[PDB]
Design a protein around this ligand. Structure first.
Ligand SMILES: O=C[C@H](O)[C@@H](O)[C@H](O)CO
Ligand SMILES: O=C[C@H](O)[C@@H](O)[C@H](O)CO
Ligand SMILES: O=C[C@H](O)[C@@H](O)[C@H](O)CO
Ligand SMILES: O=C[C@H](O)[C@@H](O)[C@H](O)CO
Ligand SMILES: [Mg+2]
Ligand SMILES: [Mg+2]
Ligand SMILES: [Mg+2]
Ligand SMILES: [Mg+2]
Ligand SMILES: [Mg+2]
Ligand SMILES: [Mg+2]
Ligand SMILES: [Mg+2]
Ligand SMILES: [Mg+2]
Lengths: 392, 392, 392, 392
């Protein structure tokens, strides 16, 4: 299979650029030059690149340096045809953010965190980015008495409302995507799941400008069903971006290649995003890989892993397509009544009174007889896996 | 410490009445008589009792029978001075509900599920219940291709909108509390965390009427911080009811006595609910125990475990109070800047233009210096634990 | 593909016979007649059937009744040609076993548990069973102070030594396989992982007669790597039997069809078992399916699910074979140095004195140069998955 | 309370010396001087200090320097009276160990790893250490096809056999303690639980020289019951050392102060270690704290956290003794038949023949009457907790 710009595969500069310094060891790889990253990615089929302010411009660079770096980066995008669909800000690495950015108990840190983001919004706008991703990695706590969650949510809200105000006033037209994570690096992070992030966004001043950027491994760290979570995000129309990667359940954040973790869920996910209503994808944004080339690899291993992500997505798509197109699957879908859930429970114009008067819905209903019919779910499931396995 | 009606301890009929028939063994206790249960609960200090329709009136009882049971039940209530703060409907036991009640693939079951709940609403209304708890235990799936999540949410919403319609027309004054659970009995259940349920509720026709009924153990099954999720629920003003119990992380639902699983989180939870805003509780509803007396116990064990629930709460409350009243704690709270989070990040009348003009929030900000000061959070945590252990 | 008797696929009478009564609901299926189960299994390609004493003969059957059942049973076996490779005893259903069988705190229960087992060994020996599986589902605790573990291990060992004795004296020639499980139905089960069971077995009077019966989902309930634990069981030579099924990480025991849980781990498990050293399988006992047809299915779904287990195993076996015969996979293996681990670290005849003498092992070792070479693990993992996907 | 040298509280240099560089951010604390560490710890009550070669002497220090550091370190011990009970080797930080030390696919790395340990054994022997802790943090894999587990166990064994040989020949008198961990930093680590580690040790050439060093957080990362695992380790007589800390279930390794994670299990653990048979502790080695002062803390928080470890153990000890001494507890233990588990199942001289002859153990046994009696476990648990809360 071959990747096209229409596939919209994007990679964070911090992904292929991860030097592999983990919590227990030193880096095993040298630093990647942003310009080189741009050329390599272009080469493997990516349509865009993303970055944290500090990934491109070293924290504390003078404007002369800063400016120089932006200029070169800009050239590279130019020559290669790559776009910058999203930008984000690093509010977790520097020691000042040890208790968070937007929700640090220290007031001065909160003012500083907003400034850092405003600045990144400026660069984003200049490069044509449409989405600002906010990953509140340090917002949370290790101890319950150390953080007033209520106050914290008020402060998270206060900061986001200002950001939307500014973007709207400067006419940047950005969309904001809150990225949920349950833990790591804080004992517990605020807005731990896709659900909590969506509920929170609904309380902002201009909620229509806000959505979520769910990550495969983040939901899997709590042993949740990522596909089902995305389905809910789509129902709400809050899926503004997505970070794809792999994880093996509740343990540290692994960031494996997409599909190298829960393979069955990777399959149902591609199916959900691609076999949307009327042939068309249910999702239109970037298919962004927020992963890390394993610590045991060298740059060869790095480019390999970059391509594996694209490969995995395209192989899965291909099988998801075939699954749905199979008349035997179509038949099994019918038997399991999957589409019958789309029919309203109530007849047209029917209310409580008409339902209360319908004896077939209760008084004359044979629950025992209906309770005995099988749904044929194992069989439908087995058909899906045989398609995944290329055995059908 | 002794329980008062003011404490508002309530228990489900199904908790003390659980016969301890589990997934791998027969019942070890005989059935508990409801009148008996009312009488025993009144005696241990409970102010109220709750029940699923099928816990009181056996599935399929003729009207004569059903009518007789209610009459006896009401009399017991009468005599003991116990109220019915909440009622719920069993939409999970009978085989007809094997693929869900409101979201079953089968349209006829969905219709029947609504009828079963309307009927329970009438009875709750009759007994003076204020809350209708909805636990969608069979809503979800074992395989991703078996359930269209989107359509399922539409149907869950279609059903709730109708229930609210009816309650409102009839003047019942009920409040609806959705109860989230990540799994069990289904592989994955729709609306798995407190967050997912709050986000969903914000999408119904009369949202003001809807909230959640989170359960200690259900959030812990995903390894989430229960106190922290309750904090967010209170922030959204959607904590309509609470189910208290104990659990040991992600494994089957244990339903232990409150405080017998994660004790530290049980402590921070009581602190949150009781050491509210004024001096007053932050939550005013029933303190409901949704637990199960261990299968190894007889009826002496059952009554002991009921009392243990009340005892754990009162003991934790007492230590939470003492913690907050301690001068050394006040000092640790001041050093950790807990209260500083409550001060707006921005000065009154400050917007992005003023923030951008503040050189001190960025250009002249000494992040290195700020990042070197400690928050003293361990010390604060240590004082909290010492209060819990009665060591101070 | 089609299963042959050489494949050695076996099923427990309790798998296809599960009536689907779970922790939250009634059975959805009627009971399966054992003779009918024998015929249906033979028909789908199973070579054997296994059972708990109470699956075949209802608890408390008089001797005439029990004898009658056993005889009809044997006739079915005879006519179909199916064998009984393993038998087991139910020490978890009856209320008497609420605190365990061999380790109940109650002495009389421990004496009864041993007699229930001895009686099953006789029947096993008469049906030709070669393995007795021991699953101590009720040995454990919900509270730490309720059970003396040391005393419990002593009692466990005391019971197992007697069983080996009787078997050896009767010339039964049975091998014993302890089945580990972390929790469910007890909060914590004794001998929680394959590791704990192996270490325990090593302390018996006649260790050579004892091994383990690990189950896919049981190790996954603790989020452990099943293939890797099986690899270690094989290194100790204690894999006496195996239970294959599917699970989705830490949650109640799902008992899905094999391969329907962690697909990638199922794949590597089949590779380990069949692509053993010397062309041949690394394991030669039964490939036993200890699973449950989902509660949503009827008898058609039950047989579909039985056949899905065998199809899953054969498909994965085919892909594991092709994987290994791929010259590109071989080249990747060589590049990743997998086989180089099989070469002793020390030279023949080298001891610490000679090692200490080798400056190339330390003094002149360039750690930094070695440290920079990639292992090519990602690329290898990618080829593995492409084989599973039928993309190669 | 106050710590005495008889409490044997020890700490690793890497604990209070952790600079707080995590997977997502820079160090928030400067480096701690080892002599100072010796002094500081002596002051808070520790009786000993431990370290990794590389904690003390910077990786790649010339002989002169190394010698220099050791001599200063020896003086500080001298001056303060602290001992070095255990020493360990760093086989996880340097890039050369990315695929492991002892089981690296690369043979040259395995040879180098052995040399690096021999050298630490010498320094350990010279400082009077009695235990060599072996933590194979990089032993494992991210991908199943990348590591031959059987070969890795052979190589692990091969390296340990040699270390034992050396120690015995040099007359060092060291005992070896293998430390199990399920994951982090490798996706899956070899010897993931205390169980797997004990089983392994039993296969070595001089097993009497090997035991384990289980860590509270490591077992909790897999959601296992720490106390129960230590109870099994003591049964086997393999508890050579112990690492105490706190953790909040399956997530990244938190390394909190002991008792700051699962409080109830920290209580039962202290009870098991101290309320041993013959009044005396069941365990007499060092109570070693392998924890990390939270990243939000400065050097004051660091010493605060060090003291917290000691305070937690002593407060728990105090409650564990009060618990056992309480007459009501004594009455609950009796009703729970906790001690009846210590009486053999069989009468002295009884074997299967006499057991079979006992109609009362089977034919005339009333399983139903026995099954109806409760064990009073909930009451017993409640008393334990009230003792922990200082409520009794
Ligand atoms: O787990 C870390 C996050 O996934 C991070 O990469 C964000 O997506 C960007 O700040
Ligand atoms: O986990 C089971 C649920 O908690 C149930 O008891 C609801 O609260 C009422 O249906
Ligand atoms: O989880 C229950 C066990 O897996 C059981 O089926 C045993 O294998 C036999 O008693
Ligand atoms: O989790 C890492 C280990 O706990 C480490 O600190 C060892 O005990 C010493 O190598
Ligand atoms: Mg991530
Ligand atoms: Mg991300
Ligand atoms: Mg529950
Ligand atoms: Mg509940
Ligand atoms: Mg099982
Ligand atoms: Mg099994
Ligand atoms: Mg650790
Ligand atoms: Mg350790």
């Amino acid at each position: 299979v071959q990747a096209t710009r229409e596939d919209k595969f994007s990679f964070g500069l911090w992904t292929v650029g991860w030097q592999a310094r983990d919590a227990f060891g030193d880096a095993t790889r040298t630093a990647l030059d942003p310009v080189e990253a741009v050329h390599k990615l272009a080469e493997i089929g990516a349509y865009g690149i993303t970055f944290h302010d500090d990934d491109l411009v070293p924290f504390g660079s003078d404007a002369q340096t800063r400016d120089g770096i932006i200029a070169g980066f800009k050239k590279a995008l130019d020559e290669t045809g790559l776009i910058v669909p999203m930008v984000t800000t690093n509010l977790f690495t520097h020691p000042v953010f040890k208790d968070g950015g937007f929700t640090s108990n220290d007031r001065s840190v909160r003012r500083y965190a907003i400034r850092k983001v405003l600045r990144q919004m400026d660069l984003g706008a200049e490069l044509g980015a449409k989405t600002l991703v906010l990953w509140g990695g340090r917002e949370g706590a290790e101890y319950d008495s150390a953080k007033d969650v209520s106050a914290a949510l008020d402060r998270y809200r206060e900061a986001l409302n200002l950001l939307a105000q500014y973007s709207e006033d400067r006419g940047y037209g950005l969309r904001f995507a809150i990225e949920p994570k349950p833990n790591e690096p804080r004992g517990d992070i605020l807005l731990p799941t896709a659900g909590h992030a969506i509920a929170f966004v609904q309380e902002l001043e201009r909620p229509e400008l806000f959505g979520i950027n769910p990550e495969t491994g983040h939901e899997q760290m709590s042993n949740l069903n990522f596909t089902q979570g995305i389905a809910q995000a789509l129902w709400h129309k809050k899926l503004f971006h997505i970070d794809l990667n792999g994880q093996h359940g509740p343990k540290f954040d692994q960031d494996l290649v997409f599909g190298h973790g829960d393979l069955l869920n990777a399959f149902s996910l591609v199916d959900l995003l691609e076999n949307g209503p009327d042939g068309a994808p249910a999702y239109d944004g970037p298919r962004h890989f927020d992963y890390k080339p394993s610590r045991t690899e060298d740059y060869d291993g790095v480019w390999e892993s970059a391509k594996a992500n694209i490969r995995m997505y395209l192989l899965l798509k291909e099988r998801a397509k075939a699954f749905r197109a199979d008349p035997e699957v179509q038949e099994a879908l019918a038997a399991s009544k999957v589409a019958e859930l789309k029919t309203p429970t109530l007849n047209p114009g029917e209310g409580y009174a008409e339902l209360l008067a319908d004896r077939s819905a209760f008084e004359d209903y044979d629950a025992d007889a209906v309770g005995a019919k099988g749904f044929g779910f194992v069989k439908l499931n087995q058909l899906a896996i045989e398609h995944l396995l290329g055995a059908r």
